[PDB]
Amino acid sequence: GMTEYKLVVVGARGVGKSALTIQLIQNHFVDEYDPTIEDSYRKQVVIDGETCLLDILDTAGQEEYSAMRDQYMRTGEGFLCVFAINNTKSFEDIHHYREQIKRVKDSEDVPMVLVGNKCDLPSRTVDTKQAQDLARSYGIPFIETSAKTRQGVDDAFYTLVREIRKHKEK
Ligand SMILES: Nc1nc2c(ncn2[C@@H]2O[C@H](COP(=O)(O)OP(=O)(O)O)[C@@H](O)[C@H]2O)c(=O)[nH]1
Numbered sequence: 001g002m003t004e005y006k007l008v009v010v011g012a013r014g015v016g017k018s019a020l021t022i023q024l025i026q027n028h029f030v031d032e033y034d035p036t037i038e039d040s041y042r043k044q045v046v047i048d049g050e051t052c053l054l055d056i057l058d059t060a061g062q063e064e065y066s067a068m069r070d071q072y073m074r075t076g077e078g079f080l081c082v083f084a085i086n087n088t089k090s091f092e093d094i095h096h097y098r099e100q101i102k103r104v105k106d107s108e109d110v111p112m113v114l115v116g117n118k119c120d121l122p123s124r125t126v127d128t129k130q131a132q133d134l135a136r137s138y139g140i141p142f143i144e145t146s147a148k149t150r151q152g153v154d155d156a157f158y159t160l161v162r163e164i165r166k167h168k169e170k
């Protein structure tokens with residue numbers, strides 16, 4: 001089979017995980033998608049000439065059993081850590097997602113991309129500079145996105161794939 005990249009989209013409720021994923025996969029913006037639905041989505045794409053499958057888990061938070069969370073973190077190869085630029089608590093929550101994914105995978109080298117979503121909105125509580133500072137500390141890319149206008153969306157997911165490739169080659 002073509003190479004498959006198992007991607008996982010994490011972040012606080014309301015940041016745009018579902019909207020980002022549906023924009024990537026289906027090329028349209030959702031105003032409303034139940035915050036409690038967690039599902040996986042698939043798309044065959046070409047990234048830097050490679051035809052590959054993206055298998056993307058749009059997470060929604062607590063699971064029936066914590067074992068289910070740990071399972072998707074172990075199977076996931078790369079993580080989009082999403083906050084919204086108008087939600088400071090969602091940015092603060094990134095510290096927890098960073099930790100938890102490393103903790104479950106028992107690894108210091110986990111492919112991740114920091115995503116500041118909703119950049120089409122002028123309303124902003126997290127300046128680009130502060131997010132750059134956090135991404136610098138993690139040694140990962142930082143991309144601002146809008147699921148609404150599509151700005152940055154392919155970049156966020158394709159960059160994550162490229163981070164996975166860099167990890168695999170070691
Ligand atoms: N303006 C704007 N609204 C967004 C964007 N992404 C998501 N939203 C809205 O933010 C709310 C939460 O989005 P959703 O995808 O359900 O967030 P989730 O809980 O992280 O899955 C919804 O009303 C979306 O329409 C974006 O980039 N721009």
Ligand SMILES: [Mg+2]
Nearest residue numbers: 017018034035
């Ligand atoms: Mg959602």
